[PDB]
């Protein structure tokens, strides 16, 4: 239609800027990264946003609300993703044997 | 901290079906997920392989967790060579 073609345009053309993530990663490493790191790390974070919004619209469709996304559907989105191990936290030393 | 992903993330939520005008407190949440996702995939990436940040260990975490992050990183590494072959 005429909205699906506009939505497909924003699904492909949108990206995080490489001039800021290379500034953001290098503040964590200390020295330097490469261009093929920033190209991949800018691409995984678009999949991760698409992992949340496609699942936060499943929270909103499950409850009785409309397309505008309140934060109620966004804290619930991170809760359901973390229970399936999708959201990694490297500060919680987990233990499976008890 | 200011918001470094305020205008970029509004295009992306529209790209996955949200609205043309998302709420400010919803982009407040998604901007903090991405900064933690890049932090909790760099803090764990500087212990694997070596104490640097080569991209041969960024591709390790994407398998056995979610195959969409792996099938969309093999496309960005293949298309880097088909966009330098055209020049």
């Amino acid at each position: 239609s005429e909205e699906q073609l506009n939505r497909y345009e924003m699904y492909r053309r949108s990206a995080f800027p490489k001039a800021a993530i290379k500034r953001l990663i290098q503040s964590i490493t200390g020295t330097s990264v490469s261009q093929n790191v920033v190209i991949a790390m800018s691409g995984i974070s678009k999949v991760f946003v698409g992992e949340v919004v496609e699942e936060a619209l499943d929270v909103c469709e499950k409850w009785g609300e409309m397309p505008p996304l309140q934060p109620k559907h966004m804290r619930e989105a991170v809760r359901r993703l973390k229970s399936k191990g999708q959201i990694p936290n490297s500060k919680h030393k987990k233990i499976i044997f008890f | 901290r200011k918001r470094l992903f305020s205008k970029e993330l509004r295009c992306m939520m529209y790209g996955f079906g949200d609205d043309q005008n998302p709420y400010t407190e919803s982009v407040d949440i998604l901007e903090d997920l991405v900064i933690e996702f890049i932090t909790e995939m760099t803090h764990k990436a500087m212990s694997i392989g070596r104490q640097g940040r080569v991209q041969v260990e960024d591709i390790v975490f994407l398998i056995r967790k979610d195959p969409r992050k792996f099938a969309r990183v093999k496309d960005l590494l293949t298309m880097n060579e088909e966009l330098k072959r055209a020049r």
Binding site: - | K7, Q20, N21, E25
Partner: peptide, 26 residues
Amino acid sequence: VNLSEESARILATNSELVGTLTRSCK
């Protein structure tokens, strides 16, 4: 020179269509 000016035109239309009014929520 063609790659330098056309890169910012994919993002310039990404500030005219999406996000016209800024909302909030209780």
